[PDB]
Amino acid sequence: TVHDVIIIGSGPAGYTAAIYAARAQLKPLVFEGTQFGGALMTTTEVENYPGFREGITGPELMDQMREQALRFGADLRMEDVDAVQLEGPVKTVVVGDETHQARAVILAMGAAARHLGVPGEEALTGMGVSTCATCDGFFFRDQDIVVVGGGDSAMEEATFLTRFARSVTLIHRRDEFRASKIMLERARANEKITFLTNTEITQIEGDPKVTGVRLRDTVTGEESKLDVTGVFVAIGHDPRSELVRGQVELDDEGYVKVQGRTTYTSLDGVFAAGDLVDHTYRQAITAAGSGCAASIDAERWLAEQ
Amino acid sequence: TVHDVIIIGSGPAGYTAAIYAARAQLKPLVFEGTQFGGALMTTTEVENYPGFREGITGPELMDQMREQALRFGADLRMEDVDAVQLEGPVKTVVVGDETHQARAVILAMGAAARHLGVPGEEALTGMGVSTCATCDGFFFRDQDIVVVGGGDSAMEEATFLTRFARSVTLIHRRDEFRASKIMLERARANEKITFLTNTEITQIEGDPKVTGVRLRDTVTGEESKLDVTGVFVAIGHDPRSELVRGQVELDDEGYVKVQGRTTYTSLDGVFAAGDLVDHTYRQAITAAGSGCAASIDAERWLAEQ
Ligand SMILES: Cc1cc2nc3c(=O)[nH]c(=O)nc-3n(C[C@H](O)[C@H](O)[C@H](O)COP(=O)(O)OP(=O)(O)OC[C@H]3O[C@@H](n4cnc5c(N)ncnc54)[C@H](O)[C@@H]3O)c2cc1C
Ligand SMILES: Cc1cc2nc3c(=O)[nH]c(=O)nc-3n(C[C@H](O)[C@H](O)[C@H](O)COP(=O)(O)OP(=O)(O)OC[C@H]3O[C@@H](n4cnc5c(N)ncnc54)[C@H](O)[C@@H]3O)c2cc1C
Ligand SMILES: Nc1ccc(Nc2ccc3c(N)nsc3c2)cc1
Ligand SMILES: Nc1ccc(Nc2ccc3c(N)nsc3c2)cc1
Ligand SMILES: [Cl-]
Ligand SMILES: [Cl-]
Ligand SMILES: [Cl-]
Ligand SMILES: [Cl-]
Ligand SMILES: [Mg+2]
Ligand SMILES: [Mg+2]
Ligand SMILES: [Mg+2]
Ligand SMILES: [Mg+2]
């Protein structure tokens, strides 16, 4: 049984691809993962996804998307793809001890935001701990917050956040910065930003919400506590391209490369969408847009065979 | 008074750009047009926009988007931009006898679908007359329908529609086809497609919904009537780039060109999104995704000044 298309991933890119493929009568087979629903399934509020004048929670939005895909006939499986064979006319995905095949595959595995890995980070996620200044900076008006990281991401998040926050403490575990000189220099010039180098967070305090961070000097071991009400983690992303490394061309940071303004990868019959590809915007609406494009690409490519 | 950003257009690209720019505290000034709300403001059902398990009407979706932009502080004006000056640090838009200025401009004027221009076309829009096989082909299962046009668009729409329709009559006013040989040959091979060359539609019949089309031979003048329940107009699109021709680089069909996978045009401080740029996907979700990207591009570009 060779399916027309298999989709790997269940964030906005994967579900939008599933909606379009199903409505196109391709009977898409979608492997959602056991941690299904993408990055929004673990935020509280989504206010910048167009179409919801008063907002919607991340889980509510993903459940709409999932039920929408189901309504048009997508075959959804809450299982992880463990391995793929993507070269040639018939592609194979392996799911535990089960195999499935398809003429086209849409890769929508997303990117993992790096975690601090400290107590309180999970408990206080959406309650003061954020990954997304664009999304959440709004909510920290006149507040004292931290940003963690040493690259252009952290510099961009920190300087952006000063238009809301009373103060931004930028914390980095080294005394050297991997961020570009321009981004570094913009952060230095901003009077609302204080730099804390050679510093790591060991714990995030907060009873319902973030009240502070515990700090350790990575050189001397000196520990202290900072009172803050927000923690923005900006230590980088890891695109989830492990399944396809060695089969589909990746850039030096592991993002799947695509041709021009399409979703076509280096492999015939293989398309890629969402934050697996995009290291620039990383929003739900852009991932959904690219998931649509992947399905239209796949449909048109299938019609050429 | 020089604004940070002006947005021209009020479809999904323009409203999503407005939402992001407003949430970024850029106080975007948005000229919606008198025919505001984009292409969806004149369809009935939008079923493939992810986030609505049971669908939503086009006007309901656009009103959500508009109120969402308002909620975050967008300044919305239901007026047409009549002329622009986009070169240099301060850009000007002219609206009747009023002028407005901004450091960045986001172009989101969309593309106009060409119309047959015959009686019944407007009355029966969304009631049998469609512009979008992806969107509406679903609803014509086992029905006899027409597709109008002579290019790759019409060939693609007609062959796609045969997976739903009982029959597809492809009508073209010439006996020569501007579509590529592959697209032409695929349509010829499909047993559900009948070709009617040298034929124009003079009227679309239908009491609540499409019941037939009146036809004229463009050579002999012979007229007849075809019983059909759907009419898909696929005679091409005109991107709304007239305002910016001679200022921003356009491709040979008039679409605004953008740099790589960004929204940057050939002019510093000018960004473009939606169907003004995209001649491939032309969906609401993709236009919304690109409107987000234009605002993020614009925000980051503004921060560099
Ligand atoms: C805390 C947080 C809050 C956010 N808030 C917002 C917001 O308010 N607005 C906004 O626009 N964006 C927000 N974002 C960003 C947005 O969620 C992402 O940009 C978007 O979800 C990317 O979608 P994607 O489909 O490419 O990947 P993801 O959302 O990462 O989805 C990929 C999914 O596929 C699954 N998958 C991966 N590999 C496999 C495999 N091998 N087999 C099976 N399944 C697999 C994953 O487990 C995951 O469930 C937020 C992100 C985070 C982390
Ligand atoms: C009948 C119909 C049904 C459709 N159904 C679907 C569907 O179900 N699903 C789907 O995904 N897509 C659908 N589409 C396509 C979708 O609507 C478009 O792809 C999308 O709206 C493009 O958005 P855009 O913002 O780029 O431009 P548009 O939607 O064209 O919006 C541009 C807006 O800006 C305004 N504007 C233009 N020039 C100026 C100016 N100089 N000054 C001020 N304002 C100006 C225009 O009047 C218009 O209101 C449909 C299209 C049509 C025509
Ligand atoms: N995958 C991955 C790679 C690198 C990191 N860096 C990191 C981790 C924890 C902390 C911390 N508590 N303060 S600064 C910091 C930085 C995290 C995850
Ligand atoms: N802008 C623009 C340019 C070209 C067209 N072509 C056209 C118009 C009407 C009809 C018809 N009634 N049957 S075939 C056809 C084709 C329409 C609009
Ligand atoms: Cl390789
Ligand atoms: Cl290998
Ligand atoms: Cl020019
Ligand atoms: Cl000129
Ligand atoms: Mg995983
Ligand atoms: Mg996830
Ligand atoms: Mg107009
Ligand atoms: Mg319109």
Short mmCIF file of N, CA, C and O in Angstrom, two decimals, chain A residues 124-207:
data_model
loop_
_atom_site.label_atom_id
_atom_site.label_comp_id
_atom_site.label_asym_id
_atom_site.label_seq_id
_atom_site.Cartn_x
_atom_site.Cartn_y
_atom_site.Cartn_z
N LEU A 124 7.08 27.11 34.95
CA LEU A 124 6.77 28.53 34.77
C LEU A 124 6.69 28.92 33.30
O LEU A 124 6.55 30.11 32.98
N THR A 125 6.76 27.95 32.39
CA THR A 125 6.55 28.22 30.98
C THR A 125 5.15 28.76 30.76
O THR A 125 4.16 28.22 31.28
N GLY A 126 5.05 29.87 30.01
CA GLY A 126 3.79 30.56 29.85
C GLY A 126 3.33 31.31 31.08
O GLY A 126 2.26 31.92 31.05
N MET A 127 4.10 31.28 32.16
CA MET A 127 3.81 32.00 33.39
C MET A 127 5.01 32.85 33.76
O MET A 127 5.34 33.01 34.94
N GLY A 128 5.69 33.40 32.76
CA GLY A 128 6.86 34.22 33.00
C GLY A 128 8.07 33.77 32.21
O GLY A 128 8.98 34.56 31.95
N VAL A 129 8.10 32.49 31.84
CA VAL A 129 9.17 31.93 31.02
C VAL A 129 8.69 31.89 29.58
O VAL A 129 7.66 31.27 29.28
N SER A 130 9.43 32.53 28.69
CA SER A 130 9.02 32.63 27.30
C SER A 130 10.22 32.34 26.41
O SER A 130 11.38 32.42 26.82
N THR A 131 9.91 31.97 25.17
CA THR A 131 10.91 31.69 24.15
C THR A 131 10.86 32.71 23.02
O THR A 131 11.64 32.59 22.07
N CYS A 132 9.96 33.68 23.11
CA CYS A 132 9.50 34.42 21.93
C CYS A 132 9.16 35.85 22.35
O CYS A 132 8.07 36.12 22.85
N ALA A 133 10.11 36.76 22.11
CA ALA A 133 9.87 38.16 22.44
C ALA A 133 8.74 38.74 21.60
O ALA A 133 7.91 39.50 22.11
N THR A 134 8.70 38.40 20.31
CA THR A 134 7.61 38.85 19.44
C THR A 134 6.27 38.51 20.07
O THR A 134 5.39 39.38 20.20
N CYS A 135 6.14 37.29 20.57
CA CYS A 135 4.87 36.80 21.11
C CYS A 135 4.54 37.43 22.46
O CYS A 135 3.42 37.91 22.68
N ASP A 136 5.50 37.40 23.39
CA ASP A 136 5.20 37.61 24.80
C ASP A 136 5.72 38.93 25.36
O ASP A 136 5.25 39.34 26.43
N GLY A 137 6.64 39.61 24.66
CA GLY A 137 7.22 40.83 25.22
C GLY A 137 6.17 41.83 25.64
O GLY A 137 6.33 42.54 26.63
N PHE A 138 5.08 41.89 24.87
CA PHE A 138 3.86 42.63 25.18
C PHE A 138 3.51 42.60 26.67
O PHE A 138 3.22 43.63 27.28
N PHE A 139 3.58 41.41 27.28
CA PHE A 139 3.01 41.17 28.60
C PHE A 139 3.92 41.60 29.74
O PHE A 139 3.52 41.49 30.91
N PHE A 140 5.13 42.08 29.45
CA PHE A 140 6.10 42.43 30.48
C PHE A 140 6.33 43.94 30.55
O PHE A 140 7.42 44.38 30.95
N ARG A 141 5.32 44.73 30.21
CA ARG A 141 5.44 46.18 30.25
C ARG A 141 5.87 46.65 31.63
O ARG A 141 5.28 46.26 32.64
N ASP A 142 6.90 47.51 31.66
CA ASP A 142 7.43 48.12 32.88
C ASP A 142 7.97 47.09 33.88
O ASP A 142 8.11 47.40 35.07
N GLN A 143 8.31 45.89 33.42
CA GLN A 143 8.81 44.84 34.30
C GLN A 143 10.31 44.66 34.12
O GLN A 143 10.89 45.02 33.09
N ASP A 144 10.95 44.06 35.14
CA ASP A 144 12.36 43.68 35.07
C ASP A 144 12.45 42.23 34.62
O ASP A 144 11.92 41.34 35.29
N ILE A 145 13.14 41.99 33.51
CA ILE A 145 13.22 40.66 32.91
C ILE A 145 14.66 40.30 32.56
O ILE A 145 15.55 41.16 32.53
N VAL A 146 14.89 39.00 32.30
CA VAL A 146 16.18 38.55 31.79
C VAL A 146 15.98 38.01 30.38
O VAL A 146 14.90 37.54 30.01
N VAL A 147 17.05 38.07 29.61
CA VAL A 147 17.20 37.32 28.36
C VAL A 147 18.47 36.48 28.48
O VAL A 147 19.50 36.98 28.95
N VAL A 148 18.40 35.22 28.08
CA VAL A 148 19.53 34.30 28.19
C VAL A 148 20.01 33.94 26.79
O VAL A 148 19.22 33.48 25.96
N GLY A 149 21.29 34.14 26.54
CA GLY A 149 21.89 33.70 25.30
C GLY A 149 23.01 34.63 24.88
O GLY A 149 23.13 35.76 25.35
N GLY A 150 23.82 34.14 23.94
CA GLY A 150 24.97 34.90 23.48
C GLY A 150 25.07 35.17 21.99
O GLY A 150 26.11 35.66 21.54
N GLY A 151 24.01 34.89 21.21
CA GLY A 151 24.02 35.06 19.78
C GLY A 151 23.05 36.14 19.30
O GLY A 151 22.36 36.79 20.08
N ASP A 152 23.01 36.31 17.96
CA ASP A 152 22.17 37.36 17.38
C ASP A 152 20.73 37.25 17.88
O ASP A 152 20.06 38.26 18.11
N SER A 153 20.25 36.02 18.06
CA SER A 153 18.92 35.80 18.61
C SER A 153 18.73 36.54 19.93
O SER A 153 17.79 37.32 20.10
N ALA A 154 19.64 36.32 20.88
CA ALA A 154 19.51 36.96 22.19
C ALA A 154 19.64 38.48 22.09
O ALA A 154 18.92 39.21 22.78
N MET A 155 20.57 38.97 21.27
CA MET A 155 20.72 40.41 21.09
C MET A 155 19.45 41.01 20.50
O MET A 155 18.98 42.07 20.94
N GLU A 156 18.87 40.34 19.50
CA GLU A 156 17.64 40.82 18.89
C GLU A 156 16.49 40.77 19.89
O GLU A 156 15.73 41.74 20.01
N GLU A 157 16.37 39.66 20.63
CA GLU A 157 15.27 39.56 21.58
C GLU A 157 15.40 40.62 22.66
O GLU A 157 14.42 41.29 23.01
N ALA A 158 16.62 40.82 23.19
CA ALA A 158 16.82 41.77 24.29
C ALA A 158 16.53 43.20 23.86
O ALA A 158 15.87 43.96 24.59
N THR A 159 17.05 43.63 22.70
CA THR A 159 16.83 45.02 22.29
C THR A 159 15.38 45.27 21.92
O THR A 159 14.84 46.35 22.20
N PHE A 160 14.74 44.28 21.28
CA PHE A 160 13.31 44.37 20.98
C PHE A 160 12.50 44.53 22.27
O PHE A 160 11.62 45.39 22.36
N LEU A 161 12.85 43.75 23.30
CA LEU A 161 12.08 43.75 24.54
C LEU A 161 12.17 45.07 25.29
O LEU A 161 11.29 45.34 26.11
N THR A 162 13.20 45.89 25.06
CA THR A 162 13.30 47.15 25.80
C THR A 162 12.17 48.12 25.45
O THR A 162 11.97 49.10 26.18
N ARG A 163 11.45 47.90 24.36
CA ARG A 163 10.33 48.80 24.10
C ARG A 163 9.14 48.49 25.01
O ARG A 163 8.21 49.29 25.08
N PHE A 164 9.17 47.36 25.72
CA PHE A 164 8.17 47.04 26.73
C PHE A 164 8.74 47.09 28.14
O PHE A 164 8.21 47.81 29.00
N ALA A 165 9.82 46.36 28.38
CA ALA A 165 10.33 46.15 29.73
C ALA A 165 10.94 47.41 30.32
O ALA A 165 11.46 48.28 29.60
N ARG A 166 10.84 47.52 31.65
CA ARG A 166 11.59 48.53 32.38
C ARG A 166 13.09 48.28 32.32
O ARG A 166 13.87 49.22 32.16
N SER A 167 13.51 47.02 32.43
CA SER A 167 14.92 46.70 32.31
C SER A 167 15.07 45.29 31.75
O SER A 167 14.20 44.44 31.94
N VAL A 168 16.20 45.05 31.07
CA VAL A 168 16.53 43.75 30.49
C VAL A 168 17.94 43.39 30.94
O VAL A 168 18.89 44.12 30.64
N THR A 169 18.07 42.27 31.66
CA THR A 169 19.37 41.72 32.04
C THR A 169 19.70 40.58 31.10
O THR A 169 19.04 39.54 31.11
N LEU A 170 20.71 40.78 30.26
CA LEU A 170 21.13 39.78 29.28
C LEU A 170 22.20 38.90 29.91
O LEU A 170 23.30 39.37 30.20
N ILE A 171 21.88 37.61 30.10
CA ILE A 171 22.75 36.67 30.81
C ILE A 171 23.36 35.69 29.81
O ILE A 171 22.65 35.11 28.98
N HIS A 172 24.68 35.51 29.89
CA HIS A 172 25.41 34.62 29.00
C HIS A 172 26.46 33.86 29.81
O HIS A 172 27.17 34.46 30.61
N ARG A 173 26.56 32.54 29.57
CA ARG A 173 27.46 31.70 30.38
C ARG A 173 28.93 31.84 30.01
O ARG A 173 29.77 31.23 30.68
N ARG A 174 29.28 32.58 28.97
CA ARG A 174 30.68 32.84 28.66
C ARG A 174 30.95 34.33 28.80
O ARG A 174 30.03 35.13 29.04
N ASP A 175 32.21 34.73 28.65
CA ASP A 175 32.54 36.14 28.56
C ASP A 175 32.79 36.57 27.12
O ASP A 175 33.19 37.72 26.89
N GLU A 176 32.57 35.68 26.17
CA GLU A 176 32.67 35.99 24.75
C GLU A 176 31.32 35.74 24.10
O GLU A 176 30.56 34.87 24.54
N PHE A 177 31.04 36.49 23.04
CA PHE A 177 29.71 36.54 22.45
C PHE A 177 29.80 36.08 21.00
O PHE A 177 30.59 36.62 20.22
N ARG A 178 28.99 35.08 20.65
CA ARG A 178 28.96 34.58 19.28
C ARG A 178 28.10 35.45 18.37
O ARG A 178 28.05 35.20 17.16
N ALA A 179 27.44 36.47 18.92
CA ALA A 179 26.63 37.37 18.12
C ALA A 179 27.50 38.29 17.27
O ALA A 179 28.64 38.61 17.62
N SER A 180 26.93 38.73 16.15
CA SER A 180 27.62 39.64 15.23
C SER A 180 27.94 40.96 15.93
O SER A 180 27.30 41.34 16.91
N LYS A 181 28.94 41.66 15.40
CA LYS A 181 29.39 42.89 16.04
C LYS A 181 28.29 43.94 16.06
O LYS A 181 28.15 44.68 17.04
N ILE A 182 27.51 44.03 14.98
CA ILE A 182 26.42 45.01 14.92
C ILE A 182 25.38 44.72 15.99
O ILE A 182 24.99 45.61 16.75
N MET A 183 24.92 43.46 16.07
CA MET A 183 23.95 43.10 17.10
C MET A 183 24.52 43.30 18.50
O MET A 183 23.82 43.80 19.39
N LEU A 184 25.78 42.91 18.71
CA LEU A 184 26.42 43.17 20.01
C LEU A 184 26.47 44.66 20.32
O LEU A 184 26.17 45.07 21.44
N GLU A 185 26.84 45.47 19.33
CA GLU A 185 26.99 46.90 19.57
C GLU A 185 25.65 47.59 19.81
O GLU A 185 25.56 48.52 20.62
N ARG A 186 24.59 47.15 19.11
CA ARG A 186 23.27 47.71 19.39
C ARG A 186 22.85 47.44 20.83
O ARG A 186 22.33 48.33 21.51
N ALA A 187 23.09 46.22 21.32
CA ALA A 187 22.71 45.90 22.69
C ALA A 187 23.50 46.74 23.70
O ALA A 187 22.94 47.20 24.70
N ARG A 188 24.79 46.95 23.43
CA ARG A 188 25.63 47.72 24.36
C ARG A 188 25.14 49.16 24.46
O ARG A 188 25.18 49.76 25.54
N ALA A 189 24.67 49.73 23.34
CA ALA A 189 24.23 51.12 23.32
C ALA A 189 22.91 51.35 24.03
O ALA A 189 22.61 52.49 24.40
N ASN A 190 22.11 50.30 24.25
CA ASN A 190 20.77 50.46 24.78
C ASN A 190 20.84 50.59 26.31
O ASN A 190 21.31 49.68 26.99
N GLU A 191 20.38 51.74 26.83
CA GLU A 191 20.52 52.04 28.25
C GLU A 191 19.71 51.12 29.15
O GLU A 191 19.99 51.03 30.35
N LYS A 192 18.70 50.43 28.61
CA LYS A 192 17.87 49.52 29.40
C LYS A 192 18.48 48.13 29.56
O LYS A 192 17.90 47.31 30.29
N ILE A 193 19.61 47.85 28.93
CA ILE A 193 20.20 46.51 28.91
C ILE A 193 21.43 46.50 29.81
O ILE A 193 22.31 47.36 29.67
N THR A 194 21.49 45.53 30.72
CA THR A 194 22.67 45.23 31.50
C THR A 194 23.16 43.83 31.13
O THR A 194 22.36 42.90 30.99
N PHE A 195 24.47 43.70 30.99
CA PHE A 195 25.09 42.46 30.54
C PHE A 195 25.62 41.73 31.76
O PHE A 195 26.22 42.34 32.64
N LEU A 196 25.39 40.41 31.82
CA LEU A 196 25.90 39.57 32.91
C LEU A 196 26.61 38.39 32.25
O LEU A 196 25.96 37.41 31.87
N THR A 197 27.92 38.50 32.08
CA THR A 197 28.67 37.46 31.40
C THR A 197 29.15 36.45 32.43
O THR A 197 29.04 36.65 33.63
N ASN A 198 29.65 35.32 31.93
CA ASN A 198 30.16 34.24 32.80
C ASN A 198 29.12 33.84 33.84
O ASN A 198 29.44 33.54 34.99
N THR A 199 27.85 33.85 33.43
CA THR A 199 26.74 33.62 34.35
C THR A 199 25.78 32.61 33.74
O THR A 199 25.43 32.71 32.56
N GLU A 200 25.35 31.65 34.55
CA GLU A 200 24.29 30.72 34.17
C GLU A 200 23.13 30.83 35.16
O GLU A 200 23.30 31.28 36.30
N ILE A 201 21.95 30.45 34.70
CA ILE A 201 20.78 30.33 35.57
C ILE A 201 20.77 28.91 36.13
O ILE A 201 20.96 27.95 35.38
N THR A 202 20.62 28.77 37.45
CA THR A 202 20.49 27.45 38.04
C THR A 202 19.07 27.09 38.44
O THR A 202 18.78 25.91 38.65
N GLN A 203 18.17 28.07 38.51
CA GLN A 203 16.79 27.80 38.92
C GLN A 203 15.96 29.04 38.64
O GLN A 203 16.45 30.17 38.70
N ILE A 204 14.69 28.81 38.30
CA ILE A 204 13.73 29.89 38.09
C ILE A 204 12.71 29.81 39.21
O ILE A 204 11.99 28.80 39.34
N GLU A 205 12.66 30.85 40.04
CA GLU A 205 11.72 30.90 41.16
C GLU A 205 10.37 31.43 40.69
O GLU A 205 10.31 32.35 39.87
N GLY A 206 9.29 30.83 41.19
CA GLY A 206 8.00 31.46 41.05
C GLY A 206 6.82 30.66 41.54
O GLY A 206 6.66 29.50 41.15
N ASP A 207 5.95 31.29 42.37
CA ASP A 207 4.88 30.56 43.05
C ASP A 207 3.75 30.23 42.07
O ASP A 207 3.51 29.03 41.84
#
